[PDB]
Amino acid sequence: TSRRWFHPNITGVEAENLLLTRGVDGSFLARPSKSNPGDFTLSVRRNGAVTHIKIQNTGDYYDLYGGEKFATLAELVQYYMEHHGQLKNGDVIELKYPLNCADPTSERWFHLSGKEAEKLLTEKGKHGSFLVRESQSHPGDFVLSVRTGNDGKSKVTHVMIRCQELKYDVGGGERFDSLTDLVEHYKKNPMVETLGTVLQLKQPLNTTRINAAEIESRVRELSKQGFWEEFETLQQQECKLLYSRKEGQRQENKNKNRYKNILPFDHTRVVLHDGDVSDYINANIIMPPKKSYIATQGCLQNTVNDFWRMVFQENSRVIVMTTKEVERGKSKCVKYWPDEYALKEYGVMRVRNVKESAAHDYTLRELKLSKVGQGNTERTVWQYHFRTWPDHGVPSDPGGVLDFLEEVHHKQESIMDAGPVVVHCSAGIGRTGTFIVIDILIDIIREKGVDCDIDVPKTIQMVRSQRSGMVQTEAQYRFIYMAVQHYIETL
Numbered sequence: 124t125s126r127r128w129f130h131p132n133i134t135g136v137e138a139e140n141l142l143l144t145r146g147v148d149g150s151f152l153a154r155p156s157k158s159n160p161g162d163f164t165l166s167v168r169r170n171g172a173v174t175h176i177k178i179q180n181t182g183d184y185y186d187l188y189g190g191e192k193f194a195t196l197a198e199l200v201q202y203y204m205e206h207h208g209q210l211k212n213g214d215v216i217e218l219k220y221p222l223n224c225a226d227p228t229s230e231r232w233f234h235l236s237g238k239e240a241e242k243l244l245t246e247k248g249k250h251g252s253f254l255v256r257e258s259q260s261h262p263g264d265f266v267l268s269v270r271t272g273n274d275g276k277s278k279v280t281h282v283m284i285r286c287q288e289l290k291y292d293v294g295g296g297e298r299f300d301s302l303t304d305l306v307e308h309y310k311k312n313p314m315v316e317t318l319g320t321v322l323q324l325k326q327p328l329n330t331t332r333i334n335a336a337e338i339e340s341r342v343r344e345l346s347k348q349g350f351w352e353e354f355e356t357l358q359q360q361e362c363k364l365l366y367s368r369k370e371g372q373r374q375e376n377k378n379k380n381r382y383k384n385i386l387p388f389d390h391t392r393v394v395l396h397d398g399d400v401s402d403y404i405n406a407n408i409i410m411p412p413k414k415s416y417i418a419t420q421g422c423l424q425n426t427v428n429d430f431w432r433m434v435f436q437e438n439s440r441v442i443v444m445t446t447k448e449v450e451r452g453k454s455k456c457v458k459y460w461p462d463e464y465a466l467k468e469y470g471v472m473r474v475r476n477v478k479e480s481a482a483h484d485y486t487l488r489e490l491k492l493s494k495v496g497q498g499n500t501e502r503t504v505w506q507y508h509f510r511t512w513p514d515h516g517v518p519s520d521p522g523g524v525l526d527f528l529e530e531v532h533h534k535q536e537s538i539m540d541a542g543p544v545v546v547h548c549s550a551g552i553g554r555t556g557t558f559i560v561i562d563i564l565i566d567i568i569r570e571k572g573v574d575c576d577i578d579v580p581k582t583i584q585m586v587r588s589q590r591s592g593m594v595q596t597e598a599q600y601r602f603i604y605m606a607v608q609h610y611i612e613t614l
């Protein structure tokens with residue numbers, strides 16, 4: 124559970140000099156690419172020299188050049204640190220020693236006046252809530268503000284953090300190389316005041332949960348950048364989500380994955396029962412009377428039957444497809460539905476395409492799904508095929524997506540005992556996560572109006588604990604905020 128090898132603020136020259144003077148052969152770090160915004164670079168030292176490996180993410184997955192595709196940067200680094208000779212003139216590159224970052228930019232607790240910090244800890248703070256800010260009078264020094272406990276039963280204690288020769292301390296004891304190490308140490312060994320108060324560092328002060336009516340003000344603030352700082356602070360927390368994906372790695376299931384290293388978590392994966400290893404599909408239940416979701420990949424030819432097994436077993440009545448079958452010359456999803464008015468058998472599952480209806484942004488396909496030999500198992504599945512997501516980036520306007528989800532939501536609500544909504548793109552983490560997150564947030568607003576708290580990164584982190592890398596890019600992160608803002612404006 125450490126993402127210290129990611130340096131959000133260094134340059135290529137800085138990374139090279141840092142690896143050459145503070146690292147050894149096998150040392151590595153990751154950083155945002157300065158030449159290609161939105162991409163990343165893995166800088167690795169070997170034989171006294173540094174190599175820079177490009178990592179692209181257009182919105183679907185992290186694509187390591189000359190390597191594999193991954194759901195998060197943490198899952199990428201974990202894979203190559205644990206598989207000795209995979210990273211590559213075909214020359215083996217070893218990730219051995221993470222070169223740790225000292226920049227606190229991406230920490231949830233790092234931020235700020237002493238009055239304002241007291242205000243924030245006053246209003247949305249709890250016992251043990253804390254933050255670290257730059258000192259008011261002493262430049263280069265810092266302050267740790269902790270809430271312990273409006274009647275005097277709670278207080279805010281400020282603790283001065285002195286920076287002396289690039290090491291930090293709270294006036295005595297140990298001297299730390301970084302604010303992170305200092306906070307980590309006093310998290311485990313909390314300071315005790317003379318009269319007995321224990322300055323427990325329980326959780327960072329939440330600053331991202333806001334009232335729905337404040338979203339426009341917050342978006343204006345993040346656009347002044349605040350968006351990039353908030354997103355990367357979210358990305359750092361991905362190291363808490365390296366849950367097991369063993370079932371997807373079994374030999375019998377390797378070919379059931381569109382991308383061999385983008386796999387469902389074992390504890391939330393959809394388990395296929397009553398099979399002819401026949402229980403696997405690259406798909407996860409997503410739980411936020413709210414609806415739930417199945418986030419899954421675009422079908423392969425050899426997983427179409429499993430897809431319909433899943434849809435039938437989970438009683439799903441709505442499918443959301445957020446990709447064309449072919450985009451930019453590449454196949455993203457095999458056609459798993461019949462032509463209009465046609466009927467097909469996919470293993471033991473029978474599907475009739477009853478009728479298609481074309482809107483501008485999407486096609487709706489009314490499908491009748493049943494198990495062969497059992498006419499009483501028939502149920503209608505409504506497939507919503509979104510077709511206007513741009514080849515590059517995210518939509519410039521969220522209106523098409525919002526109108527699409529509103530229709531999808533009302534179809535689902537009209538169906539008694541409908542199961543989870545199936546959502547899929549290519550790998551099923553980027554666009555799929557974006558649609559699901561928007562739908563989760565919009566449903567809160569739809570039922571409570573402006574009188575509700577929403578917390579975009581918390582919602583994403585919760586969804587990311589159920590499928591790897593849900594919401595892939597900062598552009599998608601911005602698009603979720605813009606979609607929520609637009610939805611609130613048109614209430």
Ligand SMILES: C[C@@H]1OCC2(CCN(c3cnc4nc(Sc5ccnc(N)c5Cl)ccc4n3)CC2)[C@@H]1N
Nearest residue numbers: 228229230231233234352353356357360580581584
């Ligand atoms: C230097 C920059 O200045 C401000 C700064 C970015 C904005 N701020 C924050 C605080 N917290 C955050 N938590 C998350 S993730 C999350 C959210 C809510 N709840 C839970 N449980 C989780 Cl895990 C994601 C983004 C977050 N941005 C404050 C810190 C930067 N450091």
